[PDB]
Nucleic acid binder design. Structure first.
Ligand SMILES: Cc1cn([C@H]2C[C@H](O)[C@@H](COP(=O)(O)OP(=O)(O)OP(=O)(O)O)O2)c(=O)[nH]c1=O
Ligand SMILES: [Ca+2]
Ligand SMILES: [Ca+2]
Ligand SMILES: [Ca+2]
Ligand SMILES: [Ca+2]
Ligand SMILES: [Ca+2]
Ligand SMILES: [Ca+2]
Length: 903
DNA sequence: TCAGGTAAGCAGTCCGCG
DNA sequence: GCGGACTGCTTAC
């Protein structure tokens, strides 16, 4: 096997590297790496190094890394460009791994741990670390073992040994329901004192030093706590053994509001799973507690316990230890599903970066482009300082607020990256500028053709056409990877729908799930065998189909994130290739393409229906168009269809055979208009929407930009066994809206689109009548809480105080002088509820940490003074009024004349 | 909420709107 | 009441 790196660090004048050697063994080496940088020179000619612009460069080989860094400072003092990779470990990896890296994950030590620390006086601050660490579970992926370190004797209590036998038993037997599949994988180590616990942990850490270190909030809690605790007890040198190079750094993380401190452990890549989840999951949650995310991702219920956590070890150490083990497991289960570690490794090695750099598309692209250019002997430019300037983005059409019965959407494949490729936008393909006409002139094809020589964007920029730029070239590579995984995702989706179909008629027989690859469309053979399976086996298969879909989704959606991130990286001052000319060239081009093809679709459809000037495109956002299809359906007549699937077939055929060709023709013309290098505007049908045939459903509606709902039957080639509501923007999609309210609004929408005005009024009446039985948490609003301090004036709301902040301030007064009550954390999310006037809290609302029950100190009093009426109007009625009005219907039955009986 | 980008919606505060 | 200016927060793309 080829070697691969595990980690890389710069310490003084040494590169420190952990790696896997050609034998498959983990290794560590110190390399006094001498870096090279470059300077412009006259042709000469030496001379094999050229900058991206083609200007000749002399390589300057440095004695050590500090000389190289100091030289960069001198070149700035003098006012001259210091060229080349100034992040010296990237140059190191580039020289040391001059090939496409093939990693073997089973050789990489992925660790995930969680710790427990008991605290009577509130939250155990990692900076202080003044309380004993009384438990650590550390799973090791190489050993496949959960290592449990359990403190028996504490100032906060002396406990008995944990029982694995009691832990395995059901909650109903009195045990802790530790999953049977991990029981045998537990290595349990009890300790008589915390010193002996920490000493073994460090010895253990040394024998099995993590490469990849993860967990839930491990970066913000477990790592800083463990390091500081050890620091307080043994001294800093001992704490520093958490790093295989014995180097650590207190690092300050800045944001908009304040600053926290984390501990950088050199020679380890920390990928905090909460952070992977937030970057890669593409879900906005009301809470990021492990409990909450586990429920959502895995459908496993909350770990129940009586009393507060700060009394749990003392009252139930058995359960304490067991919940610490389950915590670690639940993260592994989430990763088994979402595969974010795999993803991170994939991308990290592809880019040749430190794995933890995957969180930064800027750092990822810097490296991909650097390695690409080094291969051609090209030298990268120096990073400059730029002032942050706003620039324009996409076009969003203003829709006429209305019901819309029949809709087909069309969408451009990977828009921004395709534009980069079509136009050939790169730092070194800039050819010049042309005199620009107002955008509408280019849209309506009446402006002077920008150029006869170069590939153009309507923002004024012209690009070379002889060769592909390094941005287009490299972005094409990641795009192709993305297209493979998306293939798998869509295939697993289709497969999922065939299984769902077969569930309508499950055979009565004891059998097993078929060994199949859900990444590929089911053969006719597999299809028939499925029609013969039991409900149990079909369900087990659906689950696997849905897991294959989620793995494909992660691999595809995040590659899409990386490629789109390049488009935006160009508009980021910290990026080596920041150029607002290039970022605006991408966005302006997109504005044109959309509005150009709106004009084209209108013309085609107006011609084919024999009308003049009617809008067929009702809406569009960034890269998609929504086309009214009422007139196409009405031409062949609604009564001419067998069932819903029949008109869905018909429109599918209309869109694939008549529409897309016309759209392709239109986009080809725009390519030759802008004189682009390559036609890559591919706009395929996405969704086909409408009511169930024979129903009073309205099909879909829009209330404004980014706010609409559609009843979808087919999406990207997936024919739904059950119609799917595609709701964009509306309150059902916002994390700030209550759960109960999301469900209810959704049902109201379902009824409007699938059933009609009457069915809608049935539900609203019933909801309104029962809503006061709903659990207080399921009707709380959620909100992130920033700048509580800013609006805090002596316990009371300052001027302009936000509603949710007032709720927090109210919560603070009610719990004042109590260290044990859960504190609201600045920057996290809170649940919010309105309070009836006259309450003992003395204000109109209260807030408390989301994902939690409100403390028993005030719960009863909160539940009593809860303003239901206000909740109903704000979160539910108002939004519903907005839907019903846009769609031209009523949620309350209005008074007619056909009713007054007997009169 | 350390970690590509812009567009644009809605809740709420404050206050004008004779 | 409702909107406009403004802050704060969230989603669509
Ligand atoms: C979803 C999304 C889109 N965009 C921009 C860039 C996209 O090219 C453009 C269109 O978005 P999308 O239509 O959502 O996706 P896409 O065209 O990039 O890729 P595909 O349709 O094949 O899945 O909007 C972002 O900048 N960030 C995002 O998170
Ligand atoms: Ca815990
Ligand atoms: Ca698209
Ligand atoms: Ca798409
Ligand atoms: Ca059957
Ligand atoms: Ca789209
Ligand atoms: Ca097509």
């Amino acid at each position: 096997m080829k070697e691969f790196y595990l980690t890389v660090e710069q310490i003084g004048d040494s590169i420190f590297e952990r790696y896997i050697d050609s034998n498959g063994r983990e290794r560590t080496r110190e390399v006094e790496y001498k870096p090279s940088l470059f300077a412009h020179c006259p042709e000469s000619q030496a001379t094999k190094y050229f900058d991206i612009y083609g200007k000749p460069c002399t390589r300057k080989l440095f004695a050590n890394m500090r000389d190289a860094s100091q030289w960069i400072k001198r070149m700035e003092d003098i006012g001259l460009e210091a060229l080349g990779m100034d992040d010296f470990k990237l140059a190191y990896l580039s020289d040391t791994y001059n090939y496409e890296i093939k990693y073997d994950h089973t050789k990489i030590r992925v660790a995930n741990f969680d710790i427990e620390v008991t605290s009577p006086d509130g939250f155990p601050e990692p900076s202080q670390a003044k309380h004993p660490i009384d438990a650590i579970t550390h799973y090791d992926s190489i050993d496949d073992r959960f290592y449990v370190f359990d403190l028996l004797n504490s100032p906060y209590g002396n406990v008995e040994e944990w029982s694995i036998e009691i832990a395995a038993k059901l909650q109903e037997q009195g045990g802790d329901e530790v999953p049977s599949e991990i029981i045998d994988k537990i290595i349990y180590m009890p300790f008589d004192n915390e010193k002996e616990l920490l000493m073994e942990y460090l010895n253990f850490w040394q024998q099995k030093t993590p490469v990849i270190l993860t967990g839930w909030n491990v970066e913000s809690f477990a790592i800083p706590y463990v390091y500081n605790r050890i620091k307080n007890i043994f001294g800093e040198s001992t704490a520093k053994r958490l790093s295989p190079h014995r180097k650590t750094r207190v690092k300050v993380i800045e944001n908009m509001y304040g600053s926290r401190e984390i501990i950088t452990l050199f020679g380890i890549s920390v990928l905090d799973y909460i952070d992977l989840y937030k970057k890669f999951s593409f879900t906005n949650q009301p809470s990021y507690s492990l409990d909450y995310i586990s429920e959502f991702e895995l459908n496993v219920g909350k770990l129940k316990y009586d009393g507060p956590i700060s009394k749990l070890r003392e009252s139930n150490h058995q359960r304490y230890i067991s919940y610490n083990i389950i915590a670690v497991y639940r993260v592994l289960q989430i990763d088994a599903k979402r595969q974010f570690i795999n993803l991170s490794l994939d991308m990290g090695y592809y880019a040749k970066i430190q794995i933890q750099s995957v969180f930064s598309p800027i750092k990822t692209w810097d490296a991909i482009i650097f390695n690409s250019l080094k291969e051609q002997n090209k030298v990268i430019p120096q990073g400059r300082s730029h002032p942050v300037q706003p620039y324009p983005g996409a076009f969003v059409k203003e829709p006429i607020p209305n019901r819309y019965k029949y809709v087909m959407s069309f969408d451009l494949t990977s828009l921004y990256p395709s534009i980069i490729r079509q136009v050939n936008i790169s730092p070194e393909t800039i050819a010049g500028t042309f005199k620009v006409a107002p955008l509408h002139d280019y849209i309506n094809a009446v402006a002077e053709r920008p150029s006869d020589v170069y590939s153009c964007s309507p923002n004024g920029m012209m690009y070379y056409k002889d060769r592909d730029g390094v941005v287009p070239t490299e972005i094409t590579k990641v795009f192709n990877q993305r297209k493979e995984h998306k293939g798998y995702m869509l295939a697993a989706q289709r497969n999922g729908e065939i299984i769902k179909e077969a569930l309508h008629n499950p055979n009565l027989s004891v059998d097993e799930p078929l060994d199949v690859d859900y990444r590929f469309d089911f053969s006719d053979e597999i299809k028939e065998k499925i029609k013969k399976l039991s409900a149990k086996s079909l369900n087990e298969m659906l689950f696997r189909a849905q897991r294959t879909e989620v793995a494909g989704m992660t691999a595809q959606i995040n590659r899409k994130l990386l490629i789109n991130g390049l488009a935006g990286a160009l508009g980021n001052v910290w990026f080596r290739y920041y150029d607002l000319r290039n970022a605006t060239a991408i966005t302006t081009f997109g504005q044109m393409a959309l509005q150009w093809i709106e004009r084209k679709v209108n013309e085609y459809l107006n011609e084919v229906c024999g009308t003049e000037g009617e809008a067929f495109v009702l809406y569009g956002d960034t890269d998609s168009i929504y086309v009214s299809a009422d007139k196409i359906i009405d031409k062949v007549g609604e009564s001419k269809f067998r069932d819903t699937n029949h008109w869905v077939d018909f429109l599918d055929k209309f869109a694939r055979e008549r529409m897309e060709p016309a759209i392709d023709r239109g986009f080809r013309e725009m390519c030759e208009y802008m004189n682009n290098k390559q036609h890559l505007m591919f706009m395929d049908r996405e969704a086909i929407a409408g009511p169930p045939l024979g129903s009073k459903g309205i099909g879909g509606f829009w209330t404004g930009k980014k706010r609409y709902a559609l009843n979808v039957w087919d999406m990207e080639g997936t024919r739904y066994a059950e119609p799917k509501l595609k709701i964009m923007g509306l309150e059902t999609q916002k994390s700030s809206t209550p759960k109960a309210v999301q469900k209810a609004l959704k049902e109201c929408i379902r009824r409007m689109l699938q059933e009609g005005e009457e069915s809608l009024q049935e539900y609203f009446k019933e909801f309104e009548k029962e809503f006061r039985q709903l659990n207080y948490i399921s009707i709380a609003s959620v909100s992130s809480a920033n700048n509580i301090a800013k609006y805090d004036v002596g316990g009371f709301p300052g001027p302009k105080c936000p509603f949710h902040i007032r709720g927090i301030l109210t919560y603070n007064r009610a719990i004042k002088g109590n260290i044990d009550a859960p504190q609201v954390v600045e920057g996290e999310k809170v649940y919010v509820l309105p309070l009836r006037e006259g309450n003992p809290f003395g204000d109109k609302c209260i807030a408390w940490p989301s994902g939690t029950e409100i403390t028993d100190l005030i719960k009863d009093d909160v539940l009593h003074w809860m303003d239901y009426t206000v909740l109903l109007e704000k979160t539910f009625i108002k939004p519903l009024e907005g839907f019903t009005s846009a769609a031209k219907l009523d949620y309350e039955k209005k008074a007619s004349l056909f009713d007054m009986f007997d009169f």
